[PDB]
């Protein structure tokens, strides 16, 4: 969720994960991806 992606290192993005990083979990109630 929300809270995990930002004291987990993650960046919340209705777009996709950039090329290099990996969805680690989901935001916004499964709308937005968790990228780091």
């Given at each position: 969720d929300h809270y995990?992606?930002?004291?987990?290192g993650?960046?919340?993005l209705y777009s996709?994960?950039?090329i290099f990083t990996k969805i680690?979990?989901?935001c916004?109630?499964?709308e937005?991806?968790?990228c780091k």
């Open positions: 995990n992606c930002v004291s987990s993650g960046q919340c996709a994960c950039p680690q979990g989901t916004y109630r499964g937005a991806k968790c």
